[model samples]
Target: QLLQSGGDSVQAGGSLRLSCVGSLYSYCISAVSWYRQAPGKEREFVSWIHRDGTTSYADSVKGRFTISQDQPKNTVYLRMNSLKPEDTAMYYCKAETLPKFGRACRNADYWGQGTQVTVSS
Candidate 1:
């Protein structure tokens, strides 16, 4: 139920990487999703890393962004290149648990404290 990720800055045209770790839950046992929240804006779904190691992304972050999981460390990572002003946002790592009945439905969502990334000069 505990997800942990922290903050940083990247200059425009530069690159940055952030990580999210699951304290008690194994990343291999849950699905992890990445989200973005611009200043004063609602969160937007960026991508997801499935337990099987499959990854998918939204069109908004398709090209210059990448996501990965380190199952051995119970951690997930997000990397961004070609930073822009619009990329300045609070990024989040969310872990989802599936229901016990084998349903594809999400049972619970656990969120990290959020990483505030400042993409600027």
Candidate 2:
């Protein structure tokens, strides 16, 4: 459901990098989250990568996930090791998902135009 700014999909085992940049820094930037959406399927939260170097991931994807950041370039990396065809999905970068003050459930409000990472041979 998001616009992919990078380009078309990629091949299996190939590396793909997508970035989300905006004015979120104008305010207090807390954390950023990443998600994947497949065609005809509901969007699912993949993982939440904090700027402090800690990461929280979904149980199903916990082991295979690794999210890193490059502050100098204002970018993040969602590297999937040994990609497969099923890994094809629209990946998005988002800013803090919830309100900072209260117990409101957080969600990525401002998002990047996602990058379609397609795994193929």
Candidate 3:
């Protein structure tokens, strides 16, 4: 199961923090990936957090966005600083299931319902 906070509306230059909790499985069981879907655009990759607590960001958000994991809470966090109007979008957190020992593939199998964040002003 996935848990997320309600939507947020913030002014430009402000900061926005959001979270996703993977309740069905413990933090070590899977990695979490973050995504963004702008109001009329396709979904875009934001960042990823590995089970070991390591994180990586997509080039688009590398400087302004930070992704972190809290294993004790089975939660992943996304924070965007100095937000802009263009940053308004719906964010989703997905669980990346591990591949079986004999298989070579892993996929993001479960996703949160999505949290809408709007940046105005």
Candidate 4:
């Protein structure tokens, strides 16, 4: 997977959009999940986009955040509107295989490099 934000710094009330571009092989059979990690804090699960292009968001970010996929480019996007200081964090994308009867649970097994974003003003 891919994550390259160029160390973005956005002001409060602005919008921030991040993306992950994965290999075709990874995007074909797995869902892409997005996460956030505050400085010195545990990672928080944000949302995920399925291979078929459907998305689900965590309750905390339901209204202000969105997750989507660009299937043709093997990419997943996370958009956050109305940024706040609290929104400053490192964002990450991970890939998980679909669940099977007796195999493994749908857990992110492959992770992309993270993007560092700072919200200020």
Candidate 5:
């Protein structure tokens, strides 16, 4: 989690490393996605990456977001920048689920523990 200083401010151009961790059926693998939630709302999809190394993005978030893999570390990182108070939310990471057993999966189904990043100035 990331926090602000005395005045609820962080230095401009500062960098933060954020992550989500969880379990999934390695066999049902498709891709991973990152989502953001506002104060009292539903999760919003931000970005996604496939097992085959393909990526899809939400037009509303294209310039401010990125998703990458660290194969050696077995983790994926979601980084955002030029953030403001509006960016404050709980973040979740997810893996795709299978669509066969009467459970259709098109996006994230397995999710990581969430992290809260509070931003203010």
Candidate 6:
């Protein structure tokens, strides 16, 4: 299941991190991806981590962003460094599949509620 928590408000030059934890279901065994939305903007893909631990990131983001996971804790993390005003948004974690599936995998599965992040002095 999707279990994302915590919030962040960082200064322009600071860093922020968000966690998506799963005590059960679709974590260590399945692929997951991260997305974000501005105040009312459309959802945008950020990056993805495969079941085997490989990763792919959106071209819109470079080295300033990083995504990682802890298999033992079933926790996924999204980190942003050198925060800027343009970085403010609501972040979400989306499970790639609801277990094995045809329809579910075709869809984006489920996206947990997003975490609000504000970047400002």
Per-residue CA lDDT of model 2 for 11-118, tens digit only, reads 766655555555544223467678889999999888787757788887656877677766565666676665668778888877764456345434446777767777
Judged by whole-model lDDT over C-alpha atoms, candidate 3 comes out at: 0.80
- Give candidate 3 regions above 4 Å deviation: 99-108
Q: What would the per-residue lDDT of candidate 5 be over residues 1-121, giving only the tens digit for each residue? A: 1111111234444445576433444435567777878777888887887766777777765877677755444456776666666667777777765655235343346666666766765
Model number with the top TM-score: 3
lDDT string for model 6 (1-121, tens) is 6778766787889887788876444432467788989967898888888878898888776677888988687778887777788878898998765435433344346567888889886
Clashing pairs in 1: none
Return the top candidate by lDDT.
3
Q: How many backbone clashes does candidate 4 have?
A: 0
List runs of model 4 lying over 4 Å from the truth: 1-3, 98-108
Error at 58, model 6, angstroms:
1.6
Steric clash pairs (candidate 4): none
Question: In model 4, what lDDT does residue 64 have?
Answer: 90
Give the total clashing residue pairs for model 3. 0
What are the models' TM-scores? 0.84, 0.71, 0.85, 0.81, 0.69, 0.82
lDDT score, residue 26, model 4?
A: 48
Point out the worst 10-residue segment of candidate 6 by lDDT.
99-108
Q: What Cα-based lDDT does every candidate model obtain?
A: 0.78, 0.66, 0.80, 0.76, 0.62, 0.76
Cα-based RMSD of the predictions, in order? 3.2, 4.6, 3.3, 3.7, 6.2, 3.4
- lDDT string for model 3 (65-92, tens) is 8888777787788988878898789999
lDDT of 1 by residue, 1-121 (tens): 5555546776789888878887644622568888889867888998898888889998887978899988788888887778887888888888887666255444678788778899777
- Point out the higher-scoring one by TM-score: 3 or 6: 3
- Locate the minimum summed-lDDT window of 10 residues in model 1: 98-107
Query: Which pairs, if any, clash in model 5?
Result: none
lDDT of 6: 0.76
Q: Per-residue error at 99 for model 1, in Å?
A: 4.5
Give lDDT tens digits, candidate 4, residues 1-121: 4554544899888898888876535433467888889978999999988767778888778889888877777677788887788888898888775555125344446678889889998
Which is superior by TM-score, 1 or 5?
1
